[PDB]
Design a protein around this motif. Structure first.
Motif, PDB file in Angstrom:
ATOM      1  N   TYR A   3      29.053  32.703  54.582  1.00 50.52           N
ATOM      2  CA  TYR A   3      28.413  32.210  53.370  1.00 50.52           C
ATOM      3  C   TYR A   3      28.925  32.890  52.113  1.00 50.52           C
ATOM      4  O   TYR A   3      28.526  32.530  51.010  1.00 50.52           O
ATOM      5  CB  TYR A   3      26.905  32.378  53.476  1.00 50.52           C
ATOM      6  CG  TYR A   3      26.295  31.550  54.588  1.00 50.52           C
ATOM      7  CD1 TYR A   3      26.113  30.168  54.441  1.00 50.52           C
ATOM      8  CD2 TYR A   3      25.886  32.151  55.781  1.00 50.52           C
ATOM      9  CE1 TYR A   3      25.536  29.409  55.450  1.00 50.52           C
ATOM     10  CE2 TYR A   3      25.310  31.403  56.796  1.00 50.52           C
ATOM     11  CZ  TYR A   3      25.134  30.034  56.625  1.00 50.52           C
ATOM     12  OH  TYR A   3      24.543  29.306  57.640  1.00 50.52           O
ATOM     13  N   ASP A   4      29.807  33.871  52.279  1.00 53.31           N
ATOM     14  CA  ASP A   4      30.391  34.582  51.148  1.00 53.31           C
ATOM     15  C   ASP A   4      31.845  34.179  50.960  1.00 53.31           C
ATOM     16  O   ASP A   4      32.571  34.011  51.935  1.00 53.31           O
ATOM     17  CB  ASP A   4      30.286  36.097  51.359  1.00 53.31           C
ATOM     18  CG  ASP A   4      30.826  36.545  52.702  1.00 53.31           C
ATOM     19  OD1 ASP A   4      30.871  35.731  53.645  1.00 53.31           O
ATOM     20  OD2 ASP A   4      31.192  37.726  52.831  1.00 53.31           O
ATOM     21  N   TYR A   5      32.255  34.008  49.709  1.00 55.68           N
ATOM     22  CA  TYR A   5      33.628  33.630  49.361  1.00 55.68           C
ATOM     23  C   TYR A   5      34.114  32.347  50.048  1.00 55.68           C
ATOM     24  O   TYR A   5      35.224  32.298  50.584  1.00 55.68           O
ATOM     25  CB  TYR A   5      34.590  34.777  49.684  1.00 55.68           C
ATOM     26  CG  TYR A   5      34.115  36.138  49.214  1.00 55.68           C
ATOM     27  CD1 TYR A   5      33.811  36.374  47.872  1.00 55.68           C
ATOM     28  CD2 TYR A   5      33.950  37.189  50.119  1.00 55.68           C
ATOM     29  CE1 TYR A   5      33.352  37.622  47.441  1.00 55.68           C
ATOM     30  CE2 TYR A   5      33.490  38.444  49.700  1.00 55.68           C
ATOM     31  CZ  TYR A   5      33.192  38.656  48.360  1.00 55.68           C
ATOM     32  OH  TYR A   5      32.737  39.902  47.944  1.00 55.68           O
ATOM     33  N   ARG A  33      35.921  42.308  45.138  1.00 55.66           N
ATOM     34  CA  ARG A  33      35.675  42.448  43.706  1.00 55.66           C
ATOM     35  C   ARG A  33      36.851  43.186  43.069  1.00 55.66           C
ATOM     36  O   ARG A  33      37.294  42.844  41.974  1.00 55.66           O
ATOM     37  CB  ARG A  33      34.368  43.205  43.442  1.00 55.66           C
ATOM     38  CG  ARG A  33      33.116  42.353  43.541  1.00 55.66           C
ATOM     39  CD  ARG A  33      31.909  43.066  42.934  1.00 55.66           C
ATOM     40  NE  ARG A  33      31.424  44.174  43.759  1.00 55.66           N
ATOM     41  CZ  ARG A  33      30.788  44.026  44.922  1.00 55.66           C
ATOM     42  NH1 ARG A  33      30.558  42.814  45.405  1.00 55.66           N
ATOM     43  NH2 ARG A  33      30.367  45.094  45.598  1.00 55.66           N
ATOM     44  N   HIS A  55      33.268  43.333  50.514  1.00 53.17           N
ATOM     45  CA  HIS A  55      32.691  42.760  49.293  1.00 53.17           C
ATOM     46  C   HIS A  55      33.214  43.521  48.076  1.00 53.17           C
ATOM     47  O   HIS A  55      33.690  42.928  47.096  1.00 53.17           O
ATOM     48  CB  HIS A  55      31.164  42.831  49.338  1.00 53.17           C
ATOM     49  CG  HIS A  55      30.578  42.227  50.571  1.00 53.17           C
ATOM     50  ND1 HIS A  55      30.272  42.972  51.688  1.00 53.17           N
ATOM     51  CD2 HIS A  55      30.321  40.938  50.896  1.00 53.17           C
ATOM     52  CE1 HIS A  55      29.856  42.167  52.651  1.00 53.17           C
ATOM     53  NE2 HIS A  55      29.880  40.926  52.196  1.00 53.17           N
TER      54      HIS A  55
END
Ligand SMILES: Nc1ncnc2c1ncn2[C@@H]1O[C@H](COP(=O)(O)OS(=O)(=O)O)[C@@H](O)[C@H]1O
Ligand SMILES: Nc1ncnc2c1ncn2[C@@H]1O[C@H](COP(=O)(O)OS(=O)(=O)O)[C@@H](O)[C@H]1O
Ligand SMILES: Nc1ncnc2c1ncn2[C@@H]1O[C@H](COP(=O)(O)OS(=O)(=O)O)[C@@H](O)[C@H]1O
Ligand SMILES: [Ca+2]
Ligand SMILES: [Ca+2]
Ligand SMILES: [Ca+2]
Ligand SMILES: [Ca+2]
Ligand SMILES: [Ca+2]
Ligand SMILES: [Ca+2]
Ligand SMILES: [Ca+2]
Ligand SMILES: [Ca+2]
Ligand SMILES: [Mg+2]
Ligand SMILES: [Mg+2]
Ligand code: NA
Ligand code: NA
Ligand code: NA
Ligand code: NA
Ligand code: NA
Ligand code: NA
Ligand code: NA
Ligand code: NA
Ligand code: NA
Ligand code: NA
Ligand code: NA
Ligand code: NA
Ligand code: NA
Ligand code: NA
Ligand code: NA
Lengths: 510, 510, 255
Positions: free
Chosen positions: B166-168, B239, B235
């Motif tokens: 669900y991330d990136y 970034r 994460h």
């Protein structure tokens, strides 16, 4: 001035040579024991050190009712706030007059021995109305009906030791110690300043004006016992006080912490505060706007008039035996860069400025910039640090009951989604299993700034175990903080709603 | 270049029309189910999308042993890292060849259907020695003996869907998608850069030099699947990458996340990485110093030579079919303010500078100031934010078993003492009651920056449930982080030792 | 070019005079703005000259001055447009103006206020502040009034020791003048030097003229005392607090 009643009732001093004996009795397996509640620990400490002179124990029914209806003890001594030992029916039933009870702290440290005079069941409605003005939202009334015991135990005390404190050992000066402090300094005129909030520029000016008016030294005497719910914790305030005290000219002010348990009883409390400050050695006591007042109720109406306290104190003026320095609203003057009592300006000829406490929290919660004129920089820094802005605050998202989607997958989605934002916040899927030992930890994390994703609600019978602070409900219900379209709304959709909601409430900033 | 083996094995594409059918079979109550372990989720995703071409499933014993002893699949295809499905005896016993197993993610999302070819019990000692060089501290070897199942299940896959993320969502490009990305841009020359660490100035220069040497566009292809234990979470790294990518000239670099599960297998992994990047569309692959190496063991000896990977890759040069851009130590040149390969300088005629990763964490943990030359400011900001200095770190003080004083009072004393320091840290007396559901929460708080005061130790049988990170033992024992004089040492004394210890270790700063 | 002229602050007449002087010096034009050479208003608040009397007078001698006069009306600031302009070509309320009179100017200089970037250049204000420091860096004197009954010696020491603990770079001194003008005339020198003086006795009225009254405060029971005492024998610590708070209120001390 002479302590109220003429004799400082420092029972620690008085009972010194009975220390060992009392201590033995307090720990004897036969004596009945009562563990002091927090407020009681505050009261018991002011009674044993002389702060509540002439009191020497908790009010019996005779003195209690005389205070409720007469603002005086049975013997006529001016006393507005009833100090009683509230217990439950179960305990009340085990005692009769002449009985000796051992009062403990944390069911471990024996504080004193109370010799019972009587056990009665006060009419809390009368106390609520006559003493605190009756409004059900009033802090003292809410405490009286929801926390206080329904039975009071009048009786005299014999001190073993003041309640234990491991923080600020040097600052919690007793009346006897404060008096010595003033003497070593040859201070015979000292104006005391009560407070439960952090001191800002207005206050510093107010207190200095008083020092100048009364021609007296300044005593910052803040409450670190118990104040208005939602107040800034005392640790933060002490840091603020120690910081602001440096803005006073060298050797003009002294700081001392007062372990008092306020009742937020406006005018009555003001009278009470003055009596207490007199016992502590002050020759003057400040009484500003809405002194000891809890503001307004949910309906927007005042619990007390902004100057009721001043009026009440004025009417007891000749018997308080401590001079009162009254102050009207102290506000800021932009055009002249300085503060001043509102009673000596206005006329529209001059523009004022005032940042109420409300507005103050708003900036603190929104990362706003607090005006250089309002408070000192060092103070705001300390405040922001204790009450961080939303982007550094914790929170919880509770997956409502109506949720039809996979709670497991929706949880993971939210976790992975929040993780990509970064910003130092720690996240966690938190399964409570309706266990209070887990529920009670929720606010701890939020307090720690962490973000919690809770897949299920907790039974309504335990809702009380969790602080509602920064806890949002994701549900289709109308009472959901984050309302869903349908119970089976697809995850990415739900995720976007939760993200944007948190973003809108400042928790996330990009 | 042509995918390894000649055919991109994108099984999601291949099995598309069998999607519904496979999904029904995967959810049929009769089929045997296995929930993929984290590393398996990484591998399964690289097999189904063609990243591991020619592989089309988990290696059977024949191909597995051929890779362990030959760095090749049974058919001779160059392949250095064994990709197997490790399970436990209990599960292994329920399957035979020809059987069809449903592979799930989070015991909920059906990923694929594996058709069993065989079930064998590998000799982990051989795999450890021949594939990872034998050292027991090597990450891949420790995983193999402490996490991996003792039984492997060879068999072919039929894809239902790649593992859920669900991330990136936009960045985890598949080989097919990346190739399209490059095409839409008319990129026929692309040099890929592998990485599991945040990119600093040296890397930016390294990658640009490569782009210039190879006359190719840059592909930042970082690992977000599984890397070396203790690495910076992905994460934060993402970034960082998104941030540093902006320091490249416009339109010269592309970012794509690789959900690979590294083995930190130095040279062998290098070969493997090259094969993987080739499948993904790269025409060039960088191989610097100690590529995919886990550094040194507790004895200070290298797991791999700083250039073993380069040598190994060089020897397979003619069959990798993807050009390798090798790099020697890239270091900083103070006197000239610029970085450069170490193989083209020195001679003492020039002074260099290098801030190893070790030294890097030190500044991050000590609030040190990272040099403008070493890394970009925006990057360090992101790093400090994810790995805060000691004054913002959490911790725990465990009241040792030998403690004779009142654990209750010593706890309160520590709490009240820490509270007066201020600094935004949240504190709590934490009683675990030997319940793992409470113990597992300890690192959560520490991770949240909070300070915990734990009055009792937890039984040794549960010590594994708690991460030892920033957890200090207050005891008279020699193995105590904070050693006491006597078991009954007075509280104020114990308190001072604890405070000064935390102060010495940077947790408190006054 | 510096003009060693001794002005008379004679408004319009002086303007005519100034023009004649500038002509002699080689100028072909001479500016005459608002209240040129005017000394402002008297204690009653009335103007010594009209804001444009000078311009009118100069205008009437125009044909014989033989030097051209460039007249200007009040030049003020325009916030909304960030620029200055003659007041005679704006207003109409359609535009808001801003003006920091000289009065208000000293106030900021004496109170450490911040002078607007639009009003004057930074380098200029720096030079000004440096020559006319704010109260916290200014000198002063406390004169122990005649009515004082307490020990002047002990009260002096008390004030000295008290001021010394504040710090801030100011130099202090108990100053005995003995009615000698050679000592009296030095009082303003110290004050000018930023020092704080504690003077135990007053000087005879016949010498009061020898001392500049600038930043000189009288501590006495009298009504004409800058710092009024309760009684002539008020205890020292009390007197000390009054003096400290007075100076603090007037910005000499900042904590
Ligand atoms: N603006 C103000 N003007 C006059 N008095 C004020 C002002 N603000 C606070 N005070 C006074 O400062 C004292 C303590 O202030 P607070 O801490 O906010 O509240 S209180 O509950 O202790 O009375 C009180 O005497 C109060 O009336
Ligand atoms: N100073 C350096 N000089 C040459 N190559 C380097 C240097 N630093 C990193 N690299 C290369 O950058 C790539 C990824 O670096 P890392 O993230 O530290 O580790 S790795 O496990 O992925 O290799 C590897 O090819 C590595 O050898
Ligand atoms: N705001 C203004 N508008 C127009 N003229 C001005 C203004 N301020 C100063 N002047 C002019 O500037 C010249 C010298 O100014 P000042 O030094 O303040 O005073 S003067 O005594 O020499 O006239 C005079 O011609 C004066 O009228
Ligand atoms: Ca009740
Ligand atoms: Ca009101
Ligand atoms: Ca639906
Ligand atoms: Ca095993
Ligand atoms: Ca080496
Ligand atoms: Ca002992
Ligand atoms: Ca005028
Ligand atoms: Ca007298
Ligand atoms: Mg105590
Ligand atoms: Mg995926
Ligand atoms: Na008295
Ligand atoms: Na206990
Ligand atoms: Na008075
Ligand atoms: Na009223
Ligand atoms: Na009296
Ligand atoms: Na909104
Ligand atoms: Na599940
Ligand atoms: Na071996
Ligand atoms: Na080439
Ligand atoms: Na080697
Ligand atoms: Na080729
Ligand atoms: Na040390
Ligand atoms: Na006129
Ligand atoms: Na002429
Ligand atoms: Na004043």
């Amino acid at each position: 001035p002479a302590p109220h009643g003429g004799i400082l009732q420092d029972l620690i001093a008085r009972d010194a040579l009975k220390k060992n004996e009392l201590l033995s009795e307090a720990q004897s397996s036969d004596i009945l024991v009562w563990n002091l509640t927090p407020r009681q620990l505050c009261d018991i400490e002011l009674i044993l050190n002389g702060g509540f002179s002439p009191l020497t124990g908790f009010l019996n029914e005779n003195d209690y009712s005389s205070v409720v209806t007469d603002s005086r003890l049975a013997d006529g001594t001016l006393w507005t706030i009833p100090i009683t030992l509230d217990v439950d029916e179960a305990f009340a039933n085990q005692i009769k007059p002449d009985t000796r009870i051992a009062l403990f702290q944390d069911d471990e440290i024996p504080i004193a021995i109370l010799t019972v005079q009587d056990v009665y069941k006060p009419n809390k409605t009368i106390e609520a109305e006559r003493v605190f003005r009756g409004d059900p939202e009033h802090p003292a009334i809410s405490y009286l009906f929801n926390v206080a015991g329904d039975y009071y135990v009048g009786g005299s005390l014999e001190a073993i030791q003041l309640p234990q404190h491991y923080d600020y050992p040097g600052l919690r000066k007793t009346p006897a110690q404060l008096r010595l402090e003033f003497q070593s300094r040859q201070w015979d005129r000292v104006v005391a300043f009560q407070t439960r909030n952090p001191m800002h520029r207005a206050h510093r000016e107010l207190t200095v004006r008083a020092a100048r008016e009364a021609n007296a030294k300044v005593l910052i005497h803040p409450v670190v016992g118990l104040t208005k719910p939602g107040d800034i914790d005392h640790h933060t305030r002490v840091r603020v006080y120690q910081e602001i005290i440096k803005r006073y000219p060298n050797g003009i002010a002294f700081l001392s912490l007062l372990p008092l348990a306020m009742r937020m009883s406006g005018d009555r409390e003001a009278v009470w505060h003055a009596i207490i400050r007199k016992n502590y050695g002050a020759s003057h006591f400040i009484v500003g706007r809405d002194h000891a007042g809890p503001g307004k109720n949910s309906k927007g109406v005042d619990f007390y008039g902004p100057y009721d306290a001043q009026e009440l104190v004025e009417s007891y003026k000749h018997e308080l035996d401590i001079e009162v320095v009254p102050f009207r609203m102290v506000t800021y003057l932009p055009d002249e860069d300085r503060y001043a009592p509102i009673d000596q300006i206005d006329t529209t000829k001059t523009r004022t400025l005032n940042i109420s406490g409300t507005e103050l929290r708003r900036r603190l919660r929104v990362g706003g910039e607090i005006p250089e004129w309002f408070s000192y920089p060092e103070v705001v820094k300390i405040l922001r640090e204790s009450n961080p802005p939303r982007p550094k605050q914790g929170f919880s998202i509770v997956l409502g009951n109506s949720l039809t989607v996979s709670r497991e997958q929706l949880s993971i989605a939210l976790l992975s989604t929040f993780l990509q934002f970064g910003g130092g916040r720690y996240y966690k899927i938190f399964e409570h299993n309706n266990k209070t030992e887990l529920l009670s930890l929720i606010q701890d994390f939020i307090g720690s700034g962490s973000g919690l994703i809770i897949p299920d609600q907790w039974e309504d019978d335990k809702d009380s175990v969790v602080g509602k602070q920064n806890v949002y409900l994701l549900d289709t219900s109308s009472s959901a903080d984050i309302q869903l379209e349908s119970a089976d709304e697809p995850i990415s959709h739900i995720v976007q709603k939760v993200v944007l909601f948190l973003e809108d409430n400042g928790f996330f900033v990009f």
